[PDB]
Design a protein around this motif. Sequence first.
Motif, short mmCIF file in Angstrom:
data_model
loop_
_atom_site.label_atom_id
_atom_site.label_comp_id
_atom_site.label_asym_id
_atom_site.label_seq_id
_atom_site.Cartn_x
_atom_site.Cartn_y
_atom_site.Cartn_z
N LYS A 1 -17.57 119.35 21.90
CA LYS A 1 -16.86 118.37 22.70
C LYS A 1 -17.68 117.09 22.80
O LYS A 1 -18.87 117.12 23.14
N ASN B 1 -17.59 113.10 24.36
CA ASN B 1 -17.01 112.13 25.27
C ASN B 1 -17.63 110.78 24.92
O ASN B 1 -18.85 110.66 24.80
N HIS C 1 -17.70 106.98 26.24
CA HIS C 1 -17.43 106.14 27.41
C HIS C 1 -17.92 104.72 27.17
O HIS C 1 -19.13 104.47 27.13
N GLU D 1 -12.97 112.91 23.71
CA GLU D 1 -12.37 112.22 24.85
C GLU D 1 -12.95 110.81 24.84
O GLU D 1 -14.16 110.63 24.90
N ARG E 1 -12.90 107.00 26.60
CA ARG E 1 -12.69 106.30 27.86
C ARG E 1 -13.07 104.83 27.71
O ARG E 1 -14.25 104.54 27.54
N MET F 1 -8.23 107.41 27.55
CA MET F 1 -7.94 106.55 28.67
C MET F 1 -8.38 105.15 28.28
O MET F 1 -9.52 104.95 27.85
#
Lengths: 251, 380
Positions: A172, A174, A176, A198, A200, A224
């Motif tokens: 995983k 992420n 940002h 993910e 962001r 997002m």
Amino acid sequence: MYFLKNCPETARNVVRGQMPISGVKLVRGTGNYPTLVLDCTNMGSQFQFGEVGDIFYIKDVVGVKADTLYIDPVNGNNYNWGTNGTKPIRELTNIAKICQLFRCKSVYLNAGESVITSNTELPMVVFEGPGSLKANSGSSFLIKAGGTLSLIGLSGISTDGGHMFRVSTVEKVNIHTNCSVNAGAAYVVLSEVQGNIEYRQLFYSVNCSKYIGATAGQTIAGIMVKTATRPTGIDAAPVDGNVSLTYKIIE
Amino acid sequence: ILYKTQGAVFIDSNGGAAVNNAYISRLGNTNGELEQAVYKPAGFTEVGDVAVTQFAGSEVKFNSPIIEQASFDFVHAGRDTDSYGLFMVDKPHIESSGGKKKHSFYLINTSSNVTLSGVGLSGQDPDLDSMYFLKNCPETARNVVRGQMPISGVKLVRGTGNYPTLVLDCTNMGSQFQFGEVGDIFYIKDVVGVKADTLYIDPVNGNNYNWGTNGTKPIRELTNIAKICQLFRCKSVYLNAGESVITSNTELPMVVFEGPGSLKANSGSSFLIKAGGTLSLIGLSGISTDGGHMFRVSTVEKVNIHTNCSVNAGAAYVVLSEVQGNIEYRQLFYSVNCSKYIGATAGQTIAGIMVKTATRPTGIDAAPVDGNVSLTYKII
Ligand SMILES: OC[C@H]1O[C@H](O[C@H]2[C@H](O)[C@@H](O)[C@@H](O)O[C@@H]2CO)[C@H](O)[C@@H](O)[C@@H]1O
């Protein structure tokens, strides 16, 4: 202090005890294999007053930590350890190795553009400071481990054409980015494996043709994008056909 | 050397000097604790005989010394100016009749490399006596311990000053977690190759001097639980019956918490989350606060909060992100109370929420988080 000449891959040159009180340059060498090992070495104030010399020759580090790696494209010296603020290094070439070796939690980018001209790994840590990150000559930043890569308050990150982040781990990931992001006609994220990502984006601005794409069939991703300054033309199709969304948060 | 007050004293320049297989002993230890060191560094103001004393930048190598009947086996001070002078002792054979002793290594403003040989002890005073006493060692100093700890339980370390410098380098701890004591956990900088699965707490009958990693000897306060779990890679914390409280913001390690105990944040304080991972409260008698936000998250890494116990944040939030967070919260059964499950201090935090219980603030099912949080999923 050390000069390692053609030590084989299987060799280890272990260093224990306490380094000298006064700053010294630790290692230089020749050959294609790192063999130096810091085994709980008491480094004293070496990070602030000494130099590693050639970071390539360090094979492994046990029990030696530092919170932050400092980069200064203008005043830094690659001979430096970079783990002390008064002695930053100057290039990005080895930031992933250095952070992995000393378990750094963050990277500090001093003013100026920190650039790469060939694909370069970024440690999954927090980046902060007034500096910016630039991938030139079609190169991309590489994400090779799971965790979280955060760009916080930098003057920006961009590329001259290559995809911004190439993910090669199935763990995983992420991403940002709380700074200006510009991938041009390329993607912010390209997965080279069956990824799990993910992304962001927080305020500032973002530009790309797709936020996330993959080289092959399906890579799960959550996105997002909280900024009005984005390519609204892809709100309905933010990722390429090889990426399936878990969630989508865009106004 | 058979002595009365001090065995041997080494001062100033002694570069490369060695003292091998020395056999230094006070002639018995009767009234030993009343001797007054004659040649000693300024930082050593304690009363008691000293077998070996070193200071002013002296760095003699002590190889396999045998030290007997001393109040202080070694008193060593680094050079005042820059902490120069490594305290080097390899495999000391330390003994004292009737277990009478103050400290084995009284280290002042210095670094050290000591290799233990499974021989040694700490004195009869349950509060003051310890194998090591670290006095004002600087931030850059490291006092490294290798080898085997004594067989009988001992108190490992005490100190003064603002920086931890003790390092457990693959130290063979034997049964010390069960029968010994750490003393003051604050002075331990790091640990390599020493692990324990669980950290045990008992707010009334625990003793902070204990390691806390063996069930028969739990610690008492929550102050250092994050640090301890980090040093020893603990997978869980066991809270014995009773209320474990904090009155200042305190970090919680991301591990599984179990047992009949409960958690309480008092004086408006909050529990802190500073690392990614999963914090699980399983079967506790509850966690609550007297008014402060329950969990304050200051890491941007993925945080999972799993509460399988009663939760009461009052008019406050269960979770407050102080950064642009990434949080997943799941409440399983029992009960939950709060004004909002999750909030944030600013610029958007992403979160996923699962609340599986009929005892919840039903009125916020439609608006479970504050304005600075955006939901990835909502299961209620
Ligand atoms: O900086 C040198 C040294 O000076 C003083 O040491 C004293 C010592 O305390 C006495 O016991 C005696 O041996 O005379 C020494 C100097 O002549 C400081 O007390 C000491 O801390 C310091 O290292």
